[PDB]
Scaffold this active site. Structure first.
Site, PDB file in Angstrom:
ATOM      1  N   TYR A  27       0.900  -1.219   0.099  1.00  0.00           N
ATOM      2  CA  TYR A  27      -0.083  -0.209   0.046  1.00  0.00           C
ATOM      3  C   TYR A  27       0.625   1.144  -0.098  1.00  0.00           C
ATOM      4  O   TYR A  27       0.421   2.188  -0.229  1.00  0.00           O
ATOM      5  CB  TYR A  27      -1.094   0.255   1.362  1.00  0.00           C
ATOM      6  N   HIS A  62      -4.519   6.066  -1.074  1.00  0.00           N
ATOM      7  CA  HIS A  62      -5.368   6.100   0.514  1.00  0.00           C
ATOM      8  C   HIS A  62      -4.588   6.450   1.186  1.00  0.00           C
ATOM      9  O   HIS A  62      -5.287   6.200   2.370  1.00  0.00           O
ATOM     10  CB  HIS A  62      -5.690   4.485   0.006  1.00  0.00           C
ATOM     11  N   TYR A 112      -5.635  -1.456   9.342  1.00  0.00           N
ATOM     12  CA  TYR A 112      -5.647  -1.903   8.168  1.00  0.00           C
ATOM     13  C   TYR A 112      -5.866  -0.196   9.159  1.00  0.00           C
ATOM     14  O   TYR A 112      -7.680   0.160   9.101  1.00  0.00           O
ATOM     15  CB  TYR A 112      -6.299  -2.593   7.265  1.00  0.00           C
ATOM     16  N   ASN A 159      -9.753   0.127   7.617  1.00  0.00           N
ATOM     17  CA  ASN A 159     -10.558   0.853   8.548  1.00  0.00           C
ATOM     18  C   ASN A 159     -10.681  -0.292   9.798  1.00  0.00           C
ATOM     19  O   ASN A 159     -11.818   0.369  10.507  1.00  0.00           O
ATOM     20  CB  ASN A 159     -11.617  -0.903   7.566  1.00  0.00           C
ATOM     21  N   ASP A 175      -6.898  11.178   2.081  1.00  0.00           N
ATOM     22  CA  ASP A 175      -7.212  11.290   1.306  1.00  0.00           C
ATOM     23  C   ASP A 175      -8.870  11.244   0.786  1.00  0.00           C
ATOM     24  O   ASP A 175      -9.142  10.452   1.681  1.00  0.00           O
ATOM     25  CB  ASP A 175      -6.886   9.903   0.611  1.00  0.00           C
ATOM     26  N   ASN A 198     -13.792   5.002   4.968  1.00  0.00           N
ATOM     27  CA  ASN A 198     -13.808   3.767   5.963  1.00  0.00           C
ATOM     28  C   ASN A 198     -12.454   4.103   7.432  1.00  0.00           C
ATOM     29  O   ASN A 198     -12.697   3.379   8.722  1.00  0.00           O
ATOM     30  CB  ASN A 198     -13.883   2.597   5.732  1.00  0.00           C
TER      31      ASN A 198
END
Length: 194
Positions: free
Chosen positions: A17, A22, A68, A70, A95, A116
């Site tokens: 990532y 994100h 994560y 979330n 973001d 999220n």
């Protein structure tokens, strides 16, 4: 009127990532940590990377969660709970699909608007949406079903450059953000052009 004590930069952890859209928030915090000569410490207590610098007599913590996206609220509640920071003294960089690369904006309260990380942070803080957000433009793929693949993508160079310019605009109103002077921060910021 309320000095900032926690600046949070959202992202997903891991090489998978890294440098994706994100993670714009975590890029911002990362830039902020670097300019302030702050070391980001892998702290399992807070499920994230933590650092601090002193501003105007108070410790300002920087948080990049390593859960994560979330599950970000878990990181933000841990740190903010241990230190008893209220949501009003929290700034979350993230973001923002709703603005193009090159554009950064500030907001107080409101919804997660589908993000999220923000949604979890809002849930974990006992349902208080009142914290502040630095919205870092990443553009929108134009359709809702591409969103998820898009935030998780790495932007082409032109857009990555413009994200970097908006992070530089944002660091320009750092004195205002740290003080909680949101009106002025918004004024100086929302008057820049990438």
């Amino acid at each position: 009127m309320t000095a900032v004590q926690l600046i949070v930069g959202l992202g997903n952890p891991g090489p998978e990532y890294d440098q994706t859209r994100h993670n714009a928030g975590a890029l911002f915090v990362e830039r902020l940590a670097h300019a302030q000569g702050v070391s980001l410490v892998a702290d399992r207590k807070y499920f994230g990377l933590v650092g601090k610098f002193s501003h105007q007599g108070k410790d300002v913590r920087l948080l990049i969660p390593t859960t994560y996206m979330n599950r970000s609220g878990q990181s933000v509640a841990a740190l903010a709970g241990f230190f008893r920071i209220a949501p009003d003294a929290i700034l979350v960089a993230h973001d923002e699909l709703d603005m193009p690369p090159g554009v950064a904006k500030l907001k107080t309260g409101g919804g997660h608007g589908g993000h999220n990380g923000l949604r979890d942070i809002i849930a974990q803080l006992g349902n208080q949406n009142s914290f502040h957000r630095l919205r870092l433009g990443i553009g929108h793929p134009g359709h809702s079903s591409l969103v998820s693949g898009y935030v998780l993508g790495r932007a082409p160079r032109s857009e990555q450059e413009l994200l970097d310019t908006s992070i530089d605009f944002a660091l320009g109103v750092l004195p205002e953000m740290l003080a909680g002077d949101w009106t002025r921060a918004m004024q100086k910021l929302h008057s820049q052009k990438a």
